[PDB]
């Protein structure tokens, strides 16, 4: 998980 | 006074994975409402989204937000502007120098808020691995925050309402169980709670 999520 | 003031003088930490989005939004809000707050991530490394799902921008904890900012700017300034990362990194820079890992901090807290159960577990596991030598209670509380810019801000509001409530207690240790349940019933959110000791 990345911050933020990949969009 | 010139600023709002926490009458309980709680020492608060907010913790996520990369200490980038959710914890920093909460950090900023809590600090503006007058709380003594610090923030951390629990991941092995700082991870931001990239141009492809399998291509994240990964850095070590301790990398200045300013340097990560420069890094993404030179990569593709326009892309990292439109997706919001440069603004996020800019907001972070104004708060502190760099992302910090919770497992490496020596600071102690009265309340530690985590933003998802995976982080909650890492925080609790880390605390338990440490031999307590003061019997100073610390309350770990999990409040789920969805990991995007909009929900991070919403989470900051909710976490702040929670901390504000607990700050009004004149004996948190004996009040907190009941306050958590009241919050859960009124705000319709589950809070995970553990009491650990330094």
What is the C-alpha separation between B186 and B40, in angstroms, rounded? 28
Q: Which helix (H) or strand (E) holds B156?
A: helix B149-167
What is the C-alpha separation between B47 and B59, in angstroms, rounded? 7
Neighbours of A6 (CB within 10 A): 17
CATH number of the domain located at residue range(s) B1-43+100-198 in this protein: 3.40.50.2300
For residue B64, is it left (φ>0), alpha (ψ between -120 and 50) or beta?
Answer: beta
Cβ atoms of residues A3 and B18 within 8 Å? yes
As its CATH architecture, domain B44-99 has Helix non-globular (6.10)
| Minimum Cα–Cα distance from B20: chain A residue | A3
CA distance A7 to chain B (A): 8
Q: How many CA atoms lie within 13 A of B86 on its CB side?
A: 14
What is the C-alpha separation between B75 and B109, in angstroms, rounded? 38
Look at A3 and B149 and tell me if their CB atoms are within 8 Å.
Answer: no
Look at B49 and A1 and tell me if their CB atoms are within 8 Å.
Answer: no
What is the C-alpha separation between B4 and B127, in angstroms, rounded? 31
Pairing of the two strands B57-59 and B11-16: unpaired
For this entry, resolution in Å reads 2.1
Look at A6 and B56 and tell me if their CB atoms are within 8 Å.
Answer: yes
Within 8 A of A6 by CB-CB distance, chain B residues are 49-50, 53, 56
SS3 B141: strand
- Residue B46: C-alpha distances to residues B63, B65, B107, B192 (Å): 9, 10, 20, 25
For residue B135, is it left (φ>0), alpha (ψ between -120 and 50) or beta?
Answer: left
What is the C-alpha separation between B33 and B68, in angstroms, rounded? 28
Please indicate the experimental technique that yielded this structure. Answer: X-ray
Look at A3 and B53 and tell me if their CB atoms are within 8 Å.
Answer: no
Q: How many CA atoms lie within 13 A of B177 on its CB side?
A: 4
SS3 B90: helix
Encoded tokens for B162:
């929670």
Within 8 A by CB and 6+ apart from B166, the residues are: B8, B10, B111, B172, B175, B176, B179
SS3 B155: helix
Within 8 A of A5 by CB-CB distance, chain B residues are 49, 147-148
* Out of B49, B84, B152, closest to residue A2 by CB: B49
Cβ atoms of residues A4 and B148 within 8 Å? yes
The domain limits of chain B are 1-43+100-198, 44-99
DSSP B97-129: SS--BGGG-----SEEEESSHHHHHHHHHHHHT
Within 8 A by CB and 6+ apart from B191, the residues are: B141, B142, B143, B162, B180, B183, B184
Least Cα distance to B149 among B86, B192, B94, B101 occurs for B86
Whether B154 has its CB under 8 Å from any CB of chain A: the answer is no
- Residue B132: C-alpha distances to residues B52, B135, B137 (Å): 44, 6, 10
Within 8 A of A2 by CB-CB distance, chain B residues are 18, 47-50, 56, 147
Tokens 């929900």 belong to B151
Cβ atoms of residues B57 and B47 within 8 Å? yes
Within 8 A of B21 by CB-CB distance, chain A residues are 3-4
Least Cα distance to B120 among B139, B142, B98 occurs for B142
């Amino acid at each position: 998980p990345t911050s933020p999520s990949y969009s | 006074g010139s600023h709002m003031t926490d009458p309980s003088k709680l020492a608060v930490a907010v913790v996520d994975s990369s200490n980038m989005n959710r914890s920093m939004e909460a950090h900023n809000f809590l600090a503006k409402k007058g709380f003594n707050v610090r923030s951390y991530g629990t991941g092995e490394r700082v991870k931001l989204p990239g141009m492809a799902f399998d291509k994240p921008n990964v850095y070590e904890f301790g990398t200045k937000y300013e340097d990560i900012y420069r890094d993404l700017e030179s990569k593709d300034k326009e892309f990292y502007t439109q997706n919001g990362l440069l603004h996020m990194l800019d907001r972070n820079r104004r708060i502190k120098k760099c992302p910090e890992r919770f497992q490496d901090t020596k600071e102690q807290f009265d309340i530690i808020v985590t933003v998802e159960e995976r982080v909650y577990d890492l925080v609790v596991m880390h605390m338990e691995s440490m031999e307590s030598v003061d019997n100073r209670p610390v309350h770990v509380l999990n409040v789920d925050v969805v990991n995007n810019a909009e929900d991070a801000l919403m989470g900051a509001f909710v976490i702040t309402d929670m901390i504000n409530m607990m700050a009004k207690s004149t004996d948190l240790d004996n009040d907190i169980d009941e306050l958590i349940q009241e919050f859960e019933e009124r705000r319709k959110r589950v809070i995970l709670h553990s009491v650990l000791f330094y």
